[PDB]
């Protein structure tokens, strides 16, 4: 189940060779997954010191906007959305083209503090539409090919800042197939209910439906940051289940099809605030560590990397330390360093990659959820005196080849 969340707006293939994309100070640096990693400056734009880009005002992502199966550089900037197409041959277009005068800080009054902006193929046509949770609800710009985007259209008066009272500090809004039709639907962790809105197929979304009375700020006491929540396929049927890291551990509600969810159950007695897990220090992720199509729980704790394996049915084995690195004890801080759990080897078993203090480090999956010795991939993409500070730079893992 390919999903889109606030922390990871770019879906990464469970089986593939994830590339490094770094919106750095001077422009976009590409670290193509290859035998000899050689990061290069591809576009002199989308940057703090090239185009005047700011993490506080702008959004920078990767998506296939043309339908060639190549990942393009996309930037929600001031006057609109800019796209540097992947021209193949390891080159990106420079300068980019502005494909639409909306979804911008100036053009549209879009705010990182209030609104969300995603790129998703919600029509399943092979290229990414623009989907934004704005002021009055959900706005969609349909991708008509050739970088021609239709006007931003309000397709659902909900999940908005001024449409249902949605807040970044209280609520969560993801895209995921929860019905089982292969089409991304809207999933919203509101105040008292987890809601879903069905993808109607025509680029619009059905009125919100309350489906869970849990996983929310006023239903179970789930707080932003402290208790992270995730949409993921935990059974292998392609639908998104729901899993959160609460107080006493991880709670799961299983997708029973059509957006109907089973009862919320405690499946792992770990990864929660009761056992020291904190938002500021201990990032958690759902990834497939065994290549069976089921998401396992991965956590970067104090002493290093802990993993709880999925039994295959949404039930889990107990969490255990699998790596003595990438933790607090090894100098890792959320404020300065990045960490991702993605397949780098094409075996469908997620590997670990950390953008650390002075080097980008890696740990490969043996194919069964065990991890080998840490190797240094490059000196690039590391914090390095603020050369790659998260405040000014944005690092993503992405599949430039789709
Ligand atoms: C009336 C007025 O002066 N308003 C100010 C805005 O103009 C200003 O936005 C900057 O506006 C530029 C056009 O006047 C331009 O759109 C610029 O966007 C940048 O444009 C370049 C060239 O196309 C592009 O390469 C670059 O990527 C792009 N950067 C971003 C982030 O979009 C825009 O920033 C605004 C900010 O200074 O302040 C307003 O007062
Ligand atoms: C800080 C403050 O008090 N100001 C608030 C306004 O920011 C807020 O605004 C805006 O309302 C507009 C209608 O008067 C409009 O809905 C606007 O949204 C935008 O709508 C256009 C289409 O009409 C769309 O193209 C664009 O993408 C969309 N932008 C966003 C971000 O959704 C909206 O910002 C106002 C509520 O109306 O409340 C004020 O207090
Ligand atoms: C008193 C207290 O401690 N609890 C307050 C919450 O009740 C309150 O939440 C609002 O509760 C409503 C109950 O009828 C409702 O669930 C509302 O959620 C909104 O519901 C509509 C459909 O009815 C839906 O379209 C919309 O998307 C949804 N919005 C969200 C964000 O969930 C809910 O906000 C809360 C905020 O007022 O304050 C609590 O203190
Ligand atoms: C130090 C101490 O003992 N403090 C007590 C708290 O631990 C306790 O909080 C709650 O503990 C519950 C188990 O005893 C449980 O973990 C609960 O989490 C919530 O549990 C419900 C199901 O019971 C679940 O639906 C919900 O999703 C889940 N929420 C989260 C975010 O995990 C937890 O709040 C407190 C109240 O019982 O009492 C303290 O004395
Ligand atoms: C000017 C100065 O003295 N700065 C100090 C920082 O350098 C220091 O950070 C640590 O920097 C080290 C420089 O060699 C090193 O990069 C270290 O990174 C850790 O390296 C180990 C061994 O390869 C690796 O296993 C681990 O994963 C890795 N951790 C990270 C986050 O990359 C880094 O912690 C800082 C903390 O002591 O203090 C500064 O004063
Ligand atoms: C967040 C985390 O890693 N918690 C795990 C736990 O915690 C560490 C301890 O290993 C260490 O001794 O103290 C630090 C605080 O200074 C953390 O609390 O270790 C548990 C297993 O022993 C594990 O279940 C927790 O998830």
Coordinates of C-alpha atoms and ligand atoms in Angstrom, one line a residue:
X1 CA 0.0 0.0 0.0
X2 CA 1.6 3.2 -1.2
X3 CA 0.8 5.9 1.3
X4 CA 1.3 9.7 1.7
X5 CA 1.8 11.2 5.2
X6 CA 2.8 14.6 6.6
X7 CA 6.3 13.3 7.6
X8 CA 6.7 11.3 4.4
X9 CA 4.8 13.0 1.6
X10 CA 6.8 11.1 -1.0
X11 CA 6.0 7.4 -1.3
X12 CA 9.0 5.2 -1.7
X13 CA 8.8 1.8 -3.4
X14 CA 9.0 -1.1 -0.9
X15 CA 11.1 -2.9 -3.5
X16 CA 13.6 -0.7 -5.3
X17 CA 16.8 1.5 -5.2
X18 CA 15.9 4.7 -3.4
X19 CA 17.8 7.8 -4.5
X20 CA 18.9 10.8 -2.3
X21 CA 17.4 14.1 -3.2
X22 CA 18.8 17.1 -1.4
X23 CA 17.4 20.6 -1.6
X24 CA 20.6 22.2 -0.4
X25 CA 21.7 25.8 0.0
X26 CA 22.9 26.3 -3.6
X27 CA 20.3 24.1 -5.4
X28 CA 19.2 20.5 -5.8
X29 CA 21.9 17.9 -5.3
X30 CA 21.1 14.4 -6.6
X31 CA 22.6 11.4 -4.9
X32 CA 21.6 8.7 -7.4
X33 CA 21.7 5.2 -5.9
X34 CA 24.7 3.8 -7.7
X35 CA 27.9 1.7 -7.4
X36 CA 30.0 4.8 -6.9
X37 CA 27.8 7.5 -5.3
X38 CA 28.7 10.8 -6.9
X39 CA 26.3 13.6 -5.7
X40 CA 26.0 16.5 -8.2
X41 CA 24.2 19.9 -8.4
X42 CA 21.4 19.3 -10.8
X43 CA 19.3 22.5 -10.6
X44 CA 20.5 25.9 -9.4
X45 CA 17.1 26.7 -7.9
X46 CA 14.6 25.5 -5.2
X47 CA 17.2 26.6 -2.7
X48 CA 17.8 28.9 0.3
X49 CA 20.4 30.8 -1.8
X50 CA 19.1 30.1 -5.2
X51 CA 15.5 31.3 -5.8
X52 CA 15.0 32.4 -2.3
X53 CA 13.3 29.2 -1.1
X54 CA 12.4 28.8 2.6
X55 CA 11.2 25.8 4.6
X56 CA 8.9 28.1 6.5
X57 CA 7.2 29.4 3.3
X58 CA 7.6 26.7 0.7
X59 CA 7.2 23.0 0.0
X60 CA 9.7 20.9 -1.9
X61 CA 8.9 17.4 -3.2
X62 CA 9.6 14.8 -5.9
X63 CA 6.8 13.3 -8.1
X64 CA 6.3 12.1 -11.7
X65 CA 4.4 15.0 -13.3
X66 CA 4.8 13.9 -16.9
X67 CA 4.0 10.2 -16.8
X68 CA 7.3 9.0 -18.1
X69 CA 8.1 7.0 -15.0
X70 CA 10.7 9.5 -13.9
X71 CA 10.7 11.6 -10.7
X72 CA 10.6 15.3 -11.3
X73 CA 11.6 18.1 -9.0
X74 CA 8.5 20.0 -7.7
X75 CA 8.4 23.2 -5.7
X76 CA 5.4 25.0 -4.1
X77 CA 6.9 28.5 -4.1
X78 CA 5.6 32.1 -4.1
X79 CA 3.9 32.8 -7.4
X80 CA 2.9 29.2 -8.0
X81 CA 4.2 25.6 -8.5
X82 CA 7.6 25.1 -10.3
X83 CA 8.6 21.8 -12.0
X84 CA 12.1 20.8 -13.1
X85 CA 11.4 17.7 -15.2
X86 CA 13.7 14.7 -15.1
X87 CA 15.1 14.8 -18.6
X88 CA 16.7 11.4 -18.2
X89 CA 20.4 10.9 -18.9
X90 CA 21.0 12.0 -15.2
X91 CA 19.9 15.6 -15.9
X92 CA 17.1 17.8 -14.7
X93 CA 15.6 20.9 -16.4
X94 CA 17.1 24.2 -15.3
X95 CA 15.4 26.7 -15.1
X96 CA 12.1 25.0 -14.0
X97 CA 8.7 25.9 -15.4
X98 CA 5.8 27.3 -13.5
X99 CA 3.0 24.9 -14.2
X100 CA 0.2 26.6 -12.2
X101 CA -0.3 30.0 -10.5
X102 CA -1.8 28.5 -7.3
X103 CA -0.9 26.5 -4.2
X104 CA 1.7 29.2 -3.4
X105 CA 2.6 31.4 -0.5
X106 CA 1.7 34.5 -2.6
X107 CA -0.5 32.9 -5.3
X108 CA -3.3 31.3 -3.1
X109 CA -2.2 32.5 0.3
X110 CA -1.0 29.0 1.2
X111 CA 0.7 28.7 4.6
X112 CA 3.0 25.9 5.9
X113 CA 1.5 26.7 9.3
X114 CA -2.1 26.1 8.2
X115 CA -2.2 24.0 5.1
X116 CA -0.9 20.8 3.5
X117 CA 0.2 20.2 0.0
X118 CA 0.7 16.8 -1.7
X119 CA 1.4 15.3 -5.1
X120 CA -0.5 12.1 -5.9
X121 CA -1.9 10.0 -8.8
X122 CA -5.4 9.9 -7.3
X123 CA -6.9 9.1 -10.7
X124 CA -4.4 6.3 -11.4
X125 CA -3.4 7.7 -14.8
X126 CA 0.3 7.4 -14.3
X127 CA 1.1 11.0 -13.3
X128 CA 0.7 13.2 -10.2
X129 CA -2.3 15.5 -9.5
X130 CA -1.9 18.3 -7.0
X131 CA -3.9 17.9 -3.8
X132 CA -3.9 20.5 -1.1
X133 CA -5.6 20.8 2.2
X134 CA -6.3 24.5 2.2
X135 CA -8.6 26.9 4.0
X136 CA -12.0 25.9 2.8
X137 CA -11.3 22.2 2.2
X138 CA -9.6 20.0 -0.3
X139 CA -8.4 21.6 -3.5
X140 CA -7.3 19.5 -6.5
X141 CA -5.4 20.5 -9.7
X142 CA -5.8 17.7 -12.3
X143 CA -2.7 16.8 -14.3
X144 CA -3.7 16.9 -17.9
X145 CA -0.2 15.9 -19.2
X146 CA 2.5 18.0 -20.8
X147 CA 2.8 20.0 -17.6
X148 CA -0.7 21.4 -18.2
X149 CA -2.5 21.6 -14.9
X150 CA -6.2 22.4 -14.5
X151 CA -7.3 25.2 -12.2
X152 CA -7.3 24.5 -8.4
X153 CA -10.9 23.3 -7.7
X154 CA -12.5 22.8 -4.3
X155 CA -13.7 19.2 -4.4
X156 CA -14.6 18.7 -0.8
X157 CA -15.6 21.2 1.9
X158 CA -13.8 19.4 4.8
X159 CA -10.4 18.6 6.2
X160 CA -9.7 22.4 5.9
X161 CA -8.4 25.0 8.3
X162 CA -11.7 26.8 8.0
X163 CA -13.7 23.8 6.9
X164 CA -14.0 21.5 9.9
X165 CA -11.5 23.4 12.0
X166 CA -8.4 21.2 11.1
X167 CA -5.2 22.1 12.8
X168 CA -1.6 20.9 12.3
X169 CA -1.0 20.9 16.1
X170 CA -4.1 18.6 16.8
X171 CA -4.9 16.6 13.7
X172 CA -3.4 14.4 10.9
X173 CA -4.3 14.2 7.2
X174 CA -2.9 11.4 5.0
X175 CA -3.7 9.9 1.6
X176 CA -4.1 6.1 1.4
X177 CA -6.2 3.4 -0.2
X178 CA -8.6 2.3 2.6
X179 CA -11.3 0.9 0.4
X180 CA -9.3 -1.6 -1.7
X181 CA -9.9 -0.2 -5.2
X182 CA -6.3 0.8 -5.7
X183 CA -7.2 4.5 -5.4
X184 CA -5.9 6.9 -2.7
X185 CA -8.5 8.0 -0.3
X186 CA -8.4 10.7 2.4
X187 CA -7.7 9.7 6.0
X188 CA -8.1 12.3 8.7
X189 CA -7.2 12.0 12.4
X190 CA -9.5 14.7 13.8
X191 CA -10.7 15.6 17.3
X192 CA -13.0 12.7 18.2
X193 CA -12.9 10.4 15.1
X194 CA -10.7 9.0 12.4
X195 CA -12.6 10.0 9.3
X196 CA -12.2 8.8 5.7
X197 CA -13.2 10.4 2.5
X198 CA -13.6 8.1 -0.5
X199 CA -11.9 8.8 -3.8
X200 CA -14.8 9.1 -6.2
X201 CA -12.6 8.3 -9.2
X202 CA -13.4 11.6 -11.0
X203 CA -10.8 13.6 -9.1
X204 CA -13.2 14.4 -6.2
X205 CA -13.8 13.0 -2.7
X206 CA -17.0 11.8 -0.9
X207 CA -18.2 13.5 2.3
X208 CA -16.2 12.5 5.4
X209 CA -17.2 9.3 7.2
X210 CA -16.4 8.6 10.9
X211 CA -14.8 5.2 11.0
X212 CA -12.8 5.0 14.2
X213 CA -13.4 6.4 17.7
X214 CA -9.8 6.4 18.6
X215 CA -6.3 7.6 17.6
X216 CA -7.3 11.2 18.1
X217 CA -6.6 14.1 20.5
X218 CA -10.0 13.8 22.1
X219 CA -10.5 10.1 21.6
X220 CA -7.7 8.1 23.3
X221 CA -5.6 11.2 24.2
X222 CA -3.4 11.0 21.1
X223 CA -1.2 14.1 20.8
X224 CA 0.8 15.4 17.8
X225 CA 4.4 14.4 18.0
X226 CA 4.2 12.5 21.3
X227 CA 2.0 9.8 19.8
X228 CA 2.8 9.4 16.1
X229 CA 0.2 7.7 13.8
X230 CA 0.7 5.9 10.5
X231 CA -1.3 4.5 7.6
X232 CA 0.2 1.2 6.2
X233 CA -0.6 -2.2 4.8
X234 CA 0.0 -4.6 7.7
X235 CA -1.7 -7.6 6.1
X236 CA -0.6 -7.5 2.5
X237 CA -4.0 -7.0 0.8
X238 CA -3.1 -3.6 -0.5
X239 CA -5.3 -1.6 1.8
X240 CA -4.1 0.7 4.5
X241 CA -4.4 -0.3 8.1
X242 CA -3.9 2.2 11.0
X243 CA -1.2 2.0 13.6
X244 CA -0.1 4.4 16.2
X245 CA 2.6 4.6 18.8
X246 CA 0.6 5.4 22.0
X247 CA 1.6 5.4 25.6
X248 CA 1.7 1.7 26.5
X249 CA 2.8 0.7 23.0
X250 CA 1.6 0.3 19.4
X251 CA -2.1 0.1 18.7
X252 CA -3.5 -1.2 15.4
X253 CA -6.9 -1.0 13.8
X254 CA -7.1 -3.5 10.9
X255 CA -8.7 -2.5 7.6
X256 CA -11.7 -4.7 7.0
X257 CA -12.3 -3.3 3.5
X258 CA -14.4 -0.4 2.1
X259 CA -12.9 1.8 4.8
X260 CA -14.4 -0.3 7.6
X261 CA -12.0 -0.8 10.5
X262 CA -11.7 -3.5 13.2
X263 CA -11.2 -2.9 16.9
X264 CA -8.2 -1.0 18.2
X265 CA -5.7 -3.6 19.7
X266 CA -2.4 -3.3 21.5
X267 CA 0.0 -5.4 19.4
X268 CA 3.4 -4.3 20.6
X269 CA 4.3 -3.4 24.2
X270 CA 7.0 -0.9 23.2
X271 CA 7.8 2.2 21.0
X272 CA 5.6 4.3 23.3
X273 CA 6.1 7.1 25.8
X274 CA 5.8 4.7 28.7
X275 CA 9.1 3.2 27.6
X276 CA 11.0 6.4 27.0
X277 CA 10.0 7.1 23.4
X278 CA 9.9 10.8 22.8
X279 CA 9.1 12.9 19.7
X280 CA 12.1 15.2 20.1
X281 CA 14.5 12.2 20.1
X282 CA 13.2 8.9 18.9
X283 CA 11.7 8.8 15.3
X284 CA 9.5 5.8 14.4
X285 CA 8.6 4.4 11.0
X286 CA 6.6 1.7 9.3
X287 CA 8.6 -0.2 6.7
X288 CA 8.7 -3.7 5.1
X289 CA 11.8 -5.4 6.4
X290 CA 11.2 -8.8 5.0
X291 CA 9.8 -8.2 1.5
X292 CA 6.4 -9.9 2.1
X293 CA 4.3 -6.8 1.6
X294 CA 3.7 -6.3 5.3
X295 CA 4.9 -3.3 7.3
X296 CA 7.1 -3.8 10.3
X297 CA 7.7 -1.3 13.1
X298 CA 11.1 0.4 13.1
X299 CA 12.3 2.8 15.8
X300 CA 15.4 4.8 16.4
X301 CA 15.6 4.6 20.2
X302 CA 18.3 5.6 22.7
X303 CA 20.7 2.7 22.2
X304 CA 20.0 2.3 18.5
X305 CA 17.6 0.7 16.1
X306 CA 14.8 -1.5 17.5
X307 CA 12.5 -3.5 15.3
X308 CA 9.2 -5.4 15.8
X309 CA 8.4 -7.8 13.0
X310 CA 4.9 -8.3 11.5
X311 CA 3.7 -11.9 11.7
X312 CA 2.0 -11.3 8.4
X313 CA -1.5 -10.7 9.7
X314 CA -1.2 -7.4 11.6
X315 CA 0.0 -9.2 14.7
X316 CA 3.6 -8.5 15.8
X317 CA 6.5 -10.1 17.6
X318 CA 8.1 -8.2 20.5
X319 CA 10.5 -5.3 19.8
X320 CA 14.3 -6.0 20.0
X321 CA 17.5 -4.1 19.5
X322 CA 18.8 -4.9 16.0
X323 CA 21.4 -2.2 15.5
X324 CA 23.8 -0.3 17.9
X325 CA 23.8 2.9 15.8
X326 CA 21.5 5.7 14.5
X327 CA 20.3 6.2 18.1
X328 CA 20.7 9.0 20.6
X329 CA 23.6 7.2 22.1
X330 CA 25.5 7.5 18.8
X331 CA 25.0 11.3 18.7
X332 CA 21.8 11.4 16.6
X333 CA 19.4 14.3 17.1
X334 CA 16.1 15.0 15.3
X335 CA 16.9 18.7 15.0
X336 CA 20.1 18.2 13.0
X337 CA 20.1 14.7 11.4
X338 CA 17.7 12.8 9.1
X339 CA 16.9 9.1 9.1
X340 CA 15.1 6.9 6.6
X341 CA 14.0 3.3 6.3
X342 CA 13.8 2.4 2.6
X343 CA 14.9 -0.3 0.2
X344 CA 18.3 0.6 -1.3
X345 CA 19.1 -2.8 -2.7
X346 CA 16.0 -3.8 -4.7
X347 CA 15.3 -6.8 -2.5
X348 CA 12.1 -5.5 -1.0
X349 CA 13.7 -5.4 2.4
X350 CA 14.0 -1.9 3.8
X351 CA 17.5 -0.7 4.6
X352 CA 18.5 2.2 6.9
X353 CA 20.1 5.4 5.8
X354 CA 21.0 8.3 8.1
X355 CA 22.1 11.8 7.1
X356 CA 24.3 12.4 10.1
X357 CA 26.8 15.0 11.4
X358 CA 29.7 14.6 9.0
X359 CA 28.7 11.7 6.8
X360 CA 25.8 9.9 5.3
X361 CA 25.8 6.4 6.8
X362 CA 24.0 3.2 5.8
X363 CA 23.1 -0.2 7.2
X364 CA 21.8 -2.9 4.8
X365 CA 19.1 -5.4 5.5
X366 CA 20.2 -9.1 5.4
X367 CA 16.8 -9.9 3.9
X368 CA 15.2 -11.0 7.2
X369 CA 15.1 -7.8 9.2
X370 CA 18.7 -8.1 10.5
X371 CA 21.2 -5.4 9.8
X372 CA 24.9 -5.4 8.8
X373 CA 27.8 -3.1 9.9
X374 CA 27.4 0.6 9.2
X375 CA 29.1 1.9 6.1
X376 CA 29.8 5.6 5.1
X377 CA 28.3 6.3 1.7
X378 CA 29.4 9.9 1.3
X379 CA 30.4 13.1 3.2
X380 CA 27.7 15.0 1.3
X381 CA 24.2 15.5 2.7
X382 CA 25.6 15.6 6.2
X383 CA 24.9 18.5 8.7
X384 CA 28.5 19.8 8.3
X385 CA 28.4 23.1 10.2
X386 CA 24.9 23.8 8.9
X387 CA 25.6 23.1 5.3
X388 CA 22.6 20.7 5.4
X389 CA 20.7 22.2 8.3
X390 CA 17.0 21.1 8.2
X391 CA 16.0 24.7 8.9
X392 CA 17.4 25.7 5.5
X393 CA 17.7 22.4 3.6
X394 CA 15.4 19.5 2.8
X395 CA 16.5 15.9 2.3
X396 CA 14.3 13.2 0.9
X397 CA 14.6 9.6 -0.2
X398 CA 12.9 9.0 -3.6
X399 CA 12.7 6.7 -6.5
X400 CA 13.9 8.8 -9.5
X401 CA 13.1 5.8 -11.6
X402 CA 9.4 4.7 -11.4
Ligands
LIG1 C1 4.6 43.1 -5.1 C2 5.9 42.5 -4.6 O1 7.0 42.9 -4.8 N1 5.7 41.3 -3.9 C3 6.8 40.5 -3.5 C4 7.0 39.3 -4.4 O2 7.3 39.7 -5.7 C5 8.1 38.4 -3.8 O3 8.0 37.2 -4.5 C6 9.1 37.0 -5.5 O4 8.4 37.5 -6.6 C7 9.0 37.3 -7.8 C8 8.3 38.0 -8.9 O5 8.0 39.4 -8.6 C9 9.2 35.8 -8.1 O6 7.9 35.2 -8.4 C10 9.8 35.1 -6.9 O7 9.8 33.7 -7.1 C11 11.0 33.1 -7.6 O8 11.0 33.4 -9.0 C12 12.2 32.9 -9.7 C13 12.2 33.3 -11.2 O9 11.0 32.9 -11.7 C14 12.3 31.4 -9.6 O10 13.4 30.9 -10.2 C15 12.3 31.0 -8.1 O11 12.3 29.6 -7.9 C16 11.1 31.6 -7.4 N2 11.2 31.4 -5.9 C17 10.1 31.1 -5.2 C18 10.3 30.8 -3.8 O12 9.0 31.0 -5.7 C19 9.2 35.4 -5.6 O13 9.9 34.9 -4.6 C20 7.9 38.1 -2.3 C21 9.1 37.4 -1.8 O14 10.2 38.2 -1.8 O15 7.7 39.3 -1.6 C22 6.6 40.1 -2.0 O16 6.5 41.3 -1.2
LIG2 C1 -5.1 35.6 9.1 C2 -6.6 35.9 8.8 O1 -7.3 36.2 9.7 N1 -7.0 35.8 7.5 C3 -7.9 34.7 7.2 C4 -7.8 34.4 5.7 O2 -6.5 33.9 5.3 C5 -8.8 33.4 5.3 O3 -8.9 33.2 3.9 C6 -9.2 32.8 2.5 O4 -10.6 32.9 2.2 C7 -10.8 33.2 0.8 C8 -12.3 33.6 0.6 O5 -12.5 34.9 1.1 C9 -10.4 31.9 0.0 O6 -11.3 30.9 0.4 C10 -9.0 31.6 0.3 O7 -8.7 30.3 -0.3 C11 -8.3 30.2 -1.7 O8 -9.3 30.1 -2.6 C12 -9.0 30.2 -3.9 C13 -10.2 30.1 -4.8 O9 -11.1 31.1 -4.5 C14 -8.0 29.0 -4.3 O10 -7.6 29.2 -5.6 C15 -6.8 29.1 -3.3 O11 -5.9 28.0 -3.6 C16 -7.3 29.0 -1.9 N2 -6.2 29.1 -0.9 C17 -6.1 28.3 0.2 C18 -4.9 28.4 1.0 O12 -7.1 27.5 0.5 C19 -8.6 31.6 1.8 O13 -7.2 31.6 1.9 C20 -10.2 33.8 5.8 C21 -11.3 32.7 5.5 O14 -12.0 33.0 4.3 O15 -10.2 34.0 7.2 C22 -9.3 35.0 7.6 O16 -9.4 35.3 9.0
LIG3 C1 -15.2 19.5 25.2 C2 -14.0 18.7 24.8 O1 -13.1 18.4 25.6 N1 -14.0 18.2 23.6 C3 -14.0 19.1 22.4 C4 -14.4 18.4 21.1 O2 -15.7 17.9 21.2 C5 -14.2 19.3 19.9 O3 -14.4 18.6 18.8 C6 -15.5 18.7 17.8 O4 -16.4 17.8 18.3 C7 -17.5 17.7 17.4 C8 -18.6 16.8 18.1 O5 -19.8 17.0 17.4 C9 -17.0 17.1 16.1 O6 -16.6 15.8 16.3 C10 -15.9 17.9 15.5 O7 -15.3 17.2 14.4 C11 -15.8 17.6 13.1 O8 -17.0 16.9 12.8 C12 -17.5 17.2 11.5 C13 -18.7 16.4 11.3 O9 -19.6 16.4 12.4 C14 -16.5 16.9 10.4 O10 -17.0 17.4 9.2 C15 -15.1 17.7 10.7 O11 -14.2 17.3 9.8 C16 -14.7 17.3 12.1 N2 -13.5 18.1 12.4 C17 -12.4 17.6 13.1 C18 -11.2 18.4 13.1 O12 -12.5 16.5 13.7 C19 -14.8 18.2 16.5 O13 -13.9 19.1 16.0 C20 -12.9 20.0 19.9 C21 -12.8 21.1 18.8 O14 -13.9 21.9 19.0 O15 -12.6 20.6 21.2 C22 -12.6 19.7 22.3 O16 -12.2 20.4 23.4
LIG4 C1 2.2 6.1 35.8 C2 0.8 5.6 35.6 O1 0.5 4.4 35.9 N1 -0.1 6.4 35.0 C3 -1.4 6.0 34.6 C4 -1.5 6.0 33.1 O2 -0.6 5.1 32.5 C5 -2.9 5.8 32.5 O3 -2.9 6.1 31.2 C6 -3.4 5.0 30.3 O4 -2.9 3.7 30.5 C7 -3.8 2.7 29.9 C8 -3.4 1.4 30.4 O5 -3.5 1.3 31.8 C9 -3.6 2.9 28.4 O6 -2.3 2.6 28.0 C10 -4.0 4.3 28.0 O7 -3.8 4.4 26.6 C11 -5.0 4.5 25.8 O8 -5.6 3.2 26.1 C12 -6.9 3.1 25.4 C13 -7.4 1.7 25.8 O9 -7.5 1.5 27.2 C14 -6.8 3.2 23.9 O10 -8.0 3.2 23.3 C15 -6.1 4.5 23.6 O11 -5.8 4.5 22.2 C16 -4.8 4.7 24.3 N2 -4.1 6.0 24.1 C17 -2.8 6.1 23.9 C18 -2.4 7.5 23.4 O12 -2.0 5.2 24.0 C19 -3.3 5.3 28.8 O13 -3.8 6.6 28.5 C20 -3.8 6.7 33.3 C21 -5.3 6.6 32.8 O14 -5.6 5.2 32.8 O15 -3.8 6.5 34.7 C22 -2.5 6.8 35.2 O16 -2.6 6.5 36.6
LIG5 C1 33.6 21.2 16.4 C2 33.3 20.0 17.1 O1 34.0 19.5 17.9 N1 32.0 19.5 16.9 C3 31.5 18.4 17.6 C4 30.9 17.4 16.7 O2 31.9 16.9 15.8 C5 30.3 16.2 17.5 O3 29.6 15.4 16.6 C6 30.1 14.0 16.2 O4 31.0 14.5 15.2 C7 31.9 13.4 14.9 C8 33.0 14.0 14.0 O5 33.9 13.0 13.7 C9 31.2 12.3 14.2 O6 30.8 12.6 12.9 C10 29.9 11.8 15.0 O7 29.1 11.1 14.2 C11 28.9 9.7 14.5 O8 30.0 9.0 14.0 C12 30.0 7.6 14.3 C13 31.3 6.9 13.8 O9 31.2 6.9 12.3 C14 28.8 6.9 13.8 O10 28.7 5.6 14.3 C15 27.5 7.6 14.2 O11 26.4 7.1 13.6 C16 27.7 9.1 13.9 N2 26.5 9.9 14.4 C17 26.0 10.9 13.6 C18 24.9 11.7 14.2 O12 26.4 11.1 12.5 C19 29.1 13.0 15.6 O13 28.2 12.5 16.5 C20 29.3 16.7 18.5 C21 28.9 15.6 19.4 O14 30.0 15.0 20.1 O15 30.0 17.7 19.4 C22 30.5 18.8 18.7 O16 31.1 19.7 19.6
LIG6 C1 13.4 5.1 23.7 C2 14.1 3.8 24.0 O1 15.1 3.5 23.4 N1 13.6 3.0 24.9 C3 14.0 1.6 25.1 C4 14.9 1.5 26.3 O2 15.5 2.8 26.6 C5 16.7 3.4 26.9 C6 17.6 2.6 27.8 O3 18.2 1.6 27.1 C7 18.7 3.3 28.6 O4 19.2 2.5 29.6 O5 18.1 4.5 29.1 C8 17.7 5.4 28.2 C9 17.4 6.8 28.8 O6 18.6 7.4 29.2 C10 16.4 4.8 27.5 O7 15.4 4.8 28.4 O8 15.4 0.1 26.4 C11 14.3 -0.8 26.6 C12 14.9 -2.2 26.7 O9 15.7 -2.3 27.8 C13 13.4 -0.7 25.4 O10 12.3 -1.6 25.6 C14 12.9 0.7 25.2 O11 12.1 0.7 24.0

